[PDB]
Design a protein around this ligand. Structure first.
Ligand SMILES: C[C@@](O)(CCO)CC(=O)[O-]
Length: 317
């Protein structure tokens, strides 16, 4: 038997933006969404996981113990107890997370990294099945599990994540992230309030339509079309949220966006805003350093990002 296994996954950015969860426990997406996994050029933005045999079950986030009192992570660990018993000689395992270049705690990358560790121990499991269990940890786990550009189809009862383009399809593109210091609306507030909107039923249908449009663009590697659409999706999504009192795009964020509209006439860009106080700007690689070097970031900090692949495991120890 072994004693432990490590794994790694990368954080994600929504491309067709998710709002609404079917149930607080299983956390199935109410409608179809799409996303990309990202890191920096070195691959240093990441979540690293260690699952190991133990006398009692402990959950740690960057060294801080969690009472995991919802049994969010512990639910997943219990479901795959047979995997751990075979691999480690015991059903009792602990989980230790270290996040780098993202905030300490649970995330899409954290969830996917759990999946990669389990698959690492039992490689003939169906990752689409494992994904269903991972959503309890984070509803967009599939983006990070499979990597690249994905679509997660969903009718609110059954959800399925499909790989649409490899990270290699974006090698000519970069994303400059502008991080603003405004306190963010929790994702749970986003999910809870968006469904109150009278436009919500049409949004769910519009979401599914946009994902089909993305699958079509993929046929000819139309990366600009995909990101152009992501910006249109972003604008619809945040117009719906504002009408339910959730305002993600704050004053200095809107000022940056206005400038983006100006330089768009000079060279191509498209932007995305998800749930946090960040503005993500897609750009052609030849213009990435130029964008990154602009002077008036309106008090935002800058990171150079790129599209990367799915979660992966290390050999068990
Ligand atoms: C707010 C948001 O990040 C929620 C994902 O659960 C939107 C998205 O990325 O699809």
């Amino acid at each position: 038997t072994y004693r432990s296994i490590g794994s790694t996954a990368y954080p994600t950015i929504g491309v067709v933006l998710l709002g609404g969860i079917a149930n607080p426990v299983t956390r199935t997406p109410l409608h179809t969404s799409a996303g990309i996994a990202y890191s920096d050029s070195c691959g240093s933005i990441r979540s690293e996981t260690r699952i190991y045999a133990d006398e009692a079950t402990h959950i740690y986030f960057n060294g801080t113990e969690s009472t995991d009192d919802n049994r969010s992570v512990r639910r997943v660990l219990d479901r795959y107890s047979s995997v751990f018993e075979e691999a480690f000689g015991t059903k009792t395992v602990s989980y230790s997370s270290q996040n780098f270049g993202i905030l300490s705690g649970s995330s899409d990358a954290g969830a996917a990294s759990i999946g990669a560790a389990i698959l690492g121990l039992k490689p003939d499991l169906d990752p689409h099945d494992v994904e269903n269990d991972l959503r309890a940890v984070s509803e967009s786990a599939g983006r990070s599990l499979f990597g690249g550009l994905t679509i997660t189809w969903s009718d609110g009862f059954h959800a399925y994540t499909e790989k649409i383009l490899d990270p290699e399809a974006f090698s000519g593109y970069s994303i400059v992230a502008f991080a603003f210091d405004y306190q963010r609306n929790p994702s749970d507030v986003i999910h809870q309030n968006i469904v109150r909107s009278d436009l919500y039923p049409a949004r769910k249908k519009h979401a599914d339509e946009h994902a089909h449009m993305i699958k079509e663009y993929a046929k000819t590697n139309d990366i600009k079309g995909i990101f152009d659409l992501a910006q249109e999706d972003t604008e619809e999504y945040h117009s719906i949220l504002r009408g339910v009192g959730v305002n993600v795009i704050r004053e200095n964020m809107q000022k940056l966006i206005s400038y983006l509209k100006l330089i768009r006439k000079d060279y191509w860009n498209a932007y995305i805003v998800t749930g946090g106080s960040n503005v993500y700007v897609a750009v052609e690689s030849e213009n990435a350093d130029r964008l990154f070097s602009i002077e008036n970031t309106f008090g935002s900090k800058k990171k150079m990002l790129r599209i990367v692949g799915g979660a992966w495991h290390r050999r068990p120890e």
